[PDB]
Design a protein around this nucleic acid. Structure first.
Lengths: 150, 46, 72, 50
RNA sequence: CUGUUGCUUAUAGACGAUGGCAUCAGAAAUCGGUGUUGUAAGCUUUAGAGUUUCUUAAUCAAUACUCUCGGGUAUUGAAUG
RNA sequence: GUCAUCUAAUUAGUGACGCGCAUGAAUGGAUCACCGUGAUUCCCACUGUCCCUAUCUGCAAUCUAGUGAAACCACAGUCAA
RNA sequence: UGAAACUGUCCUUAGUGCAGAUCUUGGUGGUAGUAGCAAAUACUAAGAAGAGGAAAAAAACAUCUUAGAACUGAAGAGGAGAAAGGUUCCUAAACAACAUUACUUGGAUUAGGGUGAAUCGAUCCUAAAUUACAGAUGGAAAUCCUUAAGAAAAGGAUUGAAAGGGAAUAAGAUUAAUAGUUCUUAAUCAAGAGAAAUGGUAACAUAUCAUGAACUUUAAAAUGGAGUGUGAAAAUCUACGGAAGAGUUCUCUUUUCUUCUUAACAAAAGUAAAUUCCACUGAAAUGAAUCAAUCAGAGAAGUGGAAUUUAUUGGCUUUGUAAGAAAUUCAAUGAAUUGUGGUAUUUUUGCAGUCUUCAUAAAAAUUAAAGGGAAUCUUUUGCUCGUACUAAUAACCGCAACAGGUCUCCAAGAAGCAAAAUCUUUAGUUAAAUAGAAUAACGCAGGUAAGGGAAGUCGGCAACAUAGCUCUGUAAGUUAGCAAGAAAGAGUAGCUCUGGUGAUUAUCGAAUCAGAACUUUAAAGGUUAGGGG
RNA sequence: GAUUCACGCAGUGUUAACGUGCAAAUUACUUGUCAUAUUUGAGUAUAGGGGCGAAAGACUCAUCGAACUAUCUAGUAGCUGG
């Protein structure tokens, strides 16, 4: 006999594909009488038709490689295939740095460490690429403040 | 896979009567897993 | 590519069924029937097309009323 | 096409209706030569051109 | 007598042919010889650069020592029984 | 064409000479930087292109079961004079 | 043999004699059981059904189920549409023919069944353009004109888009097949029926409220592209906490995998980003700000407000719908659970400014508002037509189940700069012009090769060779922009560590860069990947 | 109207495959190109002494140094065949 109709109807009821549908090979005569969706629904309840489990796809290998990359175990020179700007875009580094430095300058002005005049001077210095990082700006601000008080 | 088979295979075939016709026989080759093939000869299992 | 390959895009009808003659000769863009000469009031007939005259003319159809009158 | 005019759809339906063979009883009439319909067509053999 | 057939037959071969054996036949394992690669899997050498948790206990650790001239393959067109 | 240069060797290439069969200025003349699946010559590197062929794999070809055309065809099919 | 018409002589008449015309039409040979039935990786075992695997191996066996092994690899051999096809859709009986063997299979034969809309489209509007009455032209057929010529049409006629504009519907379930169309539940829209308002300084705000004619104006429908930044949702990944099920387990693994969801339409606990305006004040010692810009006495910054946008109400969480659904389990219809996050990537959708044009990137139907002051909640109905199926290595066009051609939507993991090559998950399929044996020549496709290295050749044709990233270095010439990735050299693996780059106020988080010991088969090269002068 | 890769596309070379083909122009690798003088769907306009052409006498339904179709037409042939 041909159980093509039961294979298609079972997938529609079970909401899977024809690949996941299991039909009992010993109960071919019984399944063959099932020519309607109502009959198919009865067969699933009796476990003659079973939805196969999805194939297991483990991410254990991927996770354990990520942790090694965290510690630098695979980020060498022979493992890089893109340019320096491709891996770490230079424009985005400037965008992050400008936000970091301008955040600090605004915080100092509202706290009271620096007035509007010296904040204005440091604003243009920052935009002019004078300070490499957040640390470089704090000493430069600290140095200027003590000179003002001297 | 389809591209490779084990170098040596140990099988056991049994001659059994056909259920339908009493006159005829049929052979059932089965697989016998062994750890190592050293010192194994043709044994008539009974 | 003037042969087999160029015939792939042929999926746009030029002529559709006419309303006065029933043949697939109504040119869509020209808005005229190439066979029976639609909206033109007179049926399109040519003396060079002698066969086209004997394919559709008087007596080639039902003659629903004319058959009674002439027999009358 | 999924979209069609009403008159065009009816002309499609007639072509379906006319694609039938001779009924058996008509084949048993005395002096009958009409055994097969030579005007028949199938979708994959001849396009009806309409 | 000869041919077919069998040894999924060779000293032969596109197919035919040719050559050998056909119950002291044949075939197959296994065993030894003979080759190829390079020391299997399990556990042990503060092995081991260093790290962590302890508070000299452990744990992780490329690679590396002994068992190991090991393991694996070996007619398929190799040779014995 | 003649003189140099490229090579062991140059009807090839390049640089010069010019009474140029019959070059020449928007029928555009001279000039070239970038560019070109354009034409030409020479170096380095590499190689079965070659000395000079060997060998490996898949699909065919070979044989068989099923299936199964076409081009062509006066008749046909051994040579010398 | 054949079974119903025919013959001989004389005149008369003619569609009167075939071996050729590459003659016309029809039929049939040798070639010949020959050439072939070889792109798209691939099938195997058990069982069922059937006349259809038999047998001295006749070494092969179509369909269906199970298991193994595999391919397309999510820009697909997946799930759906437009055109085109037209019943090819679903089921049953049946296999004479057809799918270069066969077929119990089929997009093939026979007979039935199948397409359900107030909300999706057509219908409505106009674009490029198209066509009428009258008028003008022409010997004629006919042509021109499309609002100009008209006693025609407040202003100009017809047609023209299933991708442009456009009133209004979603979730679950159901069929052998239809479903924003049926059923349950829950909504929306249009047309109908039962001397005329307040508040706020202002920007402006008020469950219909709170009158508003002719006429006129304004706006919407309705407007290019590039690139940068960013809000939100979804997918993927991940942090903490779990609940249920599954896989591995003599070697370990507090382990690896799956589920943990929610619509249209409305509500308003809580709370965002960006832009534009309003009020107070008046900036120089000039300030404010972006990745970039850009802005200010025709008024900055500050403080307090108003508005609009952010895939329906009002953007996100949340709420009604609504858990009663759905998903994952359990028991034999009934029971359980359904937290909170991320300074991560991609996609989608908006927003903000910047750049660019000798390019400035549609109209109407239709709607609202204004200026003016003429006049004095319940319920009914929603018509016509399309709706099945393929949408392609078998439903379309090429004579066909043709390696050709044919417009779109949705889009997982690894690795990587990359939607690249390569492998896999969800889904699909294992058949797509037949196989088995042997392993000759000559081939087609893919390869290697000692020593020499273009001596081969018209010619380095073909093949070999270089190939990623980092650092050092880079000539003549030049239109000063380039040449330039010039040329040339070095580094690169694994493991164990060290340091730099922030957020928030001690905790948390990102891939990126640099450096150091040790080990080995000494490291881009599986795939992808410049020969140079 | 910068350099490249990809989805795609074209057709430089092998003067490879095939050449009674998968195909009345295709296949494989190599090569080039791959968004503004770009690619592409539908609608619409232009017609044979005409159209359209970044120009090859190219394209105008496998037909183009003048398409297809029918009538004149059994066109004429000092030439070939019977």
């Amino acid at each position: 006999v041909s159980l093509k109709l039961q294979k298609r109807l079972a997938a529609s009821v079970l909401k899977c594909g024809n690949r996941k549908v299991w039909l009992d090979p010993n109960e071919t005569p019984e399944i063959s009488l099932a020519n309607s969706r109502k009959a198919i629904r009865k067969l699933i309840k009796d476990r003659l038709i079973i939805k196969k489990p999805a194939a297991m796809h483990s991410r254990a290998r991927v996770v354990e490689r990520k942790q090694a990359k965290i510690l630098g175990r695979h980020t060498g020179h022979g493992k890089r295939k893109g340019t320096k700007n491709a891996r770490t875009p230079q424009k985005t580094l400037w965008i992050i740095r400008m936000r970091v430095l301008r955040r600090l300058l605004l915080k100092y002005r509202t706290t009271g460490k620096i007035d509007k005049h010296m904040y204005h001077d440091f604003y243009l210095k920052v935009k002019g690429n004078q300070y490499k990082n957040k640390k470089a700006l704090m000493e430069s601000i600290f140095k200027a403040l003590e000179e003002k008080k001297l | 896979g389809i591209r490779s088979v084990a170098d040596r295979i140990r099988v056991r075939m049994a001659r059994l009567p056909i259920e339908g016709e009493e006159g005829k026989f049929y052979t059932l080759v089965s697989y016998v897993p062994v750890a190592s093939f050293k010192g194994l000869v043709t044994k008539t299992v009974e | 590519t003037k042969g087999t390959s160029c015939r792939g895009t042929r999926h746009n009808k030029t002529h559709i069924l006419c309303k006065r003659c029933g043949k697939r000769s109504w040119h869509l863009q020209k808005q005229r029937c190439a066979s029976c000469g639609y909206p033109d009031a007179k049926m399109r007939q040519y003396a060079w097309g002698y066969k086209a005259l004997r394919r559709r003319t008087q007596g080639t159809g039902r003659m629903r009323h004319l058959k009674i009158a002439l027999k009358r | 096409t999924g979209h069609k005019g009403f008159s065009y759809k009816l002309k499609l339906g007639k072509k379906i209706h006319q694609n039938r063979g001779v009924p058996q009883w008509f084949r048993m009439k005395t002096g009958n030569t009409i055994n097969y319909n030579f005007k028949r067509r199938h979708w994959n053999r001849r396009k009806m051109g309409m």
